[PDB]
Amino acid sequence: MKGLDIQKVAGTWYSLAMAASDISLLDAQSAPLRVYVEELKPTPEGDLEILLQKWENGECAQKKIIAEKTKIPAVFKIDALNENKVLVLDTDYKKYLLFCMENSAEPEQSLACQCLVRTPEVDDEALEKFDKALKALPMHIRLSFNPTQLEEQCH
Amino acid sequence: LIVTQTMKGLDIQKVAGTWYSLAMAASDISLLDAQSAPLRVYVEELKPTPEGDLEILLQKWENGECAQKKIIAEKTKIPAVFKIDALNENKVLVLDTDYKKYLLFCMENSAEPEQSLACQCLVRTPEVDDEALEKFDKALKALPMHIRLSFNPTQLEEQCHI
Numbered sequence: 032m033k034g035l036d037i038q039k040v041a042g043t044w045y046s047l048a049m050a051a052s053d054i055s056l057l058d059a060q061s062a063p064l065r066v067y068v069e070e071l072k073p074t075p076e077g078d079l080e081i082l083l084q085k086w087e088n089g090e091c092a093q094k095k096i097i098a099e100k101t102k103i104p105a106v107f108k109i110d111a112l113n114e115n116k117v118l119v120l121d122t123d124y125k126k127y128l129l130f131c132m133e134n135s136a137e138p139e140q141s142l143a144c145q146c147l148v149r150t151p152e153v154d155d156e157a158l159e160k161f162d163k164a165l166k167a168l169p170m171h172i173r174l175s176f177n178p179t180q181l182e183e184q185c186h
Numbered sequence: 187l188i189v190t191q192t193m194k195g196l197d198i199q200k201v202a203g204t205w206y207s208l209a210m211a212a213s214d215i216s217l218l219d220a221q222s223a224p225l226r227v228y229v230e231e232l233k234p235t236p237e238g239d240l241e242i243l244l245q246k247w248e249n250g251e252c253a254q255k256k257i258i259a260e261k262t263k264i265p266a267v268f269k270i271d272a273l274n275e276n277k278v279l280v281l282d283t284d285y286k287k288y289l290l291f292c293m294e295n296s297a298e299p300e301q302s303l304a305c306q307c308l309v310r311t312p313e314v315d316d317e318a319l320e321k322f323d324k325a326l327k328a329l330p331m332h333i334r335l336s337f338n339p340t341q342l343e344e345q346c347h348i
């Protein structure tokens with residue numbers, strides 16, 4: 032996607048759907064890449080704070096990741112445990128956001144994608160765009176959640 | 187669910203032999219998610235019985251080993267529909283097949299049809315058949331699936347798709 036206005040993706044988001052290239056990365060509620068985005072907050076430094084949930088050590092834990100802008104407008108660099116690049120595939124700011132995360136050292140084995148939406152409702156158009164994008168990427172696991180799970184901690 | 191194969195009739199003799207679980211999908215994530223999830227089963231062989239029933243050799247990951255089991259799917263008065271004695275799955279529905287390449291089937295609890303629904307795409311050889319996967323996806327479009335899994339040929343050739 033050509034260009035991102037960070038100010039315009041601020042606020043609450045819900046992880047409506049996920050997909051990954053390796054099954055074991057989303058294989059469990061405690062799988063390494065099973066993360067639920069909650070809020071995107073621009074920082075005074077111009078970076079993007081990501082508030083998300085992850086099942087860790089037997090509890091739903093909050094994690095804070097900083098996405099720094101790069102020379103490519105849709106690509107960010109995150110200091111995270113298992114991923115280091117986030118690519119925003121598509122967004123309308125107002126309804127949905129499609130992104131992918133990967134570890135640049137192992138791009139194929141680490142690729143995961145998510146469909147984020149602004150409200151805890153099944154956005155069929157967002158899921159259609161997400162599936163169309165996934166058609167061209169080597170995904171072997173796909174997960175989708177219902178609004179009740181979307182309103183629960185760690186779904 | 188529409189058992190499309192019911193109209194065409196099912197010839198058990200022509201489904202005999204080796205099969206590979208290329209893809210699976212389920213309405214409830216927790217039933218198919220983990221490697222030891224209850225409905226994460228891998229069909230190995232179909233063997234018609236003298237009674238017209240269908241013996242099924244399958245693999246299942248349990249307690250850090252995988253295990254093999256033989257189950258008997260019993261014929262019914264409706265073609266492509268079978269009864270299986272399992273803890274919480276009791277009906278197998280053969281959605282589609284061409285006998286020579288792919289076989290789309292589903293398993294469900296008739297008592298709890300939607301929360302228990304799982305479906306699989308079986309193929310004759312350990313290769314990715316994207317036509318089979320496309321028929322599988324078209325069938326899944328009308329089912330309330332929330333998890334989908336597909337495997338690569340090496341996993342197809344491995345015990346328990348390890």
Ligand SMILES: CCCCCCCCCCCCOS(=O)(=O)O
Pocket residue numbers: 058059060061180185186215216217219220223
């Ligand atoms: C019988 C368990 C019910 C748990 C419901 C949790 C639903 C959240 C999404 C599925 C993750 C769960 O996947 S799991 O394989 O780790 O259980």
Ligand SMILES: CCCCCCCCCCCCOS(=O)(=O)O
Pocket residue numbers: 040063064065066068071079081083094096098107111112113114117119130132
């Ligand atoms: C423009 C912002 C769009 C990105 C929002 C979601 C990115 C969060 C990625 C989590 C990485 C998880 O990394 S991990 O090491 O904890 O598994």
Ligand SMILES: CCCCCCCCCCCCOS(=O)(=O)O
Pocket residue numbers: 224225227229232242244257259270272273274275278289291293
């Ligand atoms: C070509 C048709 C193949 C049909 C295979 C059906 C496999 C049955 C798996 C039941 C899982 C067991 O679940 S349980 O929890 O109830 O024991």
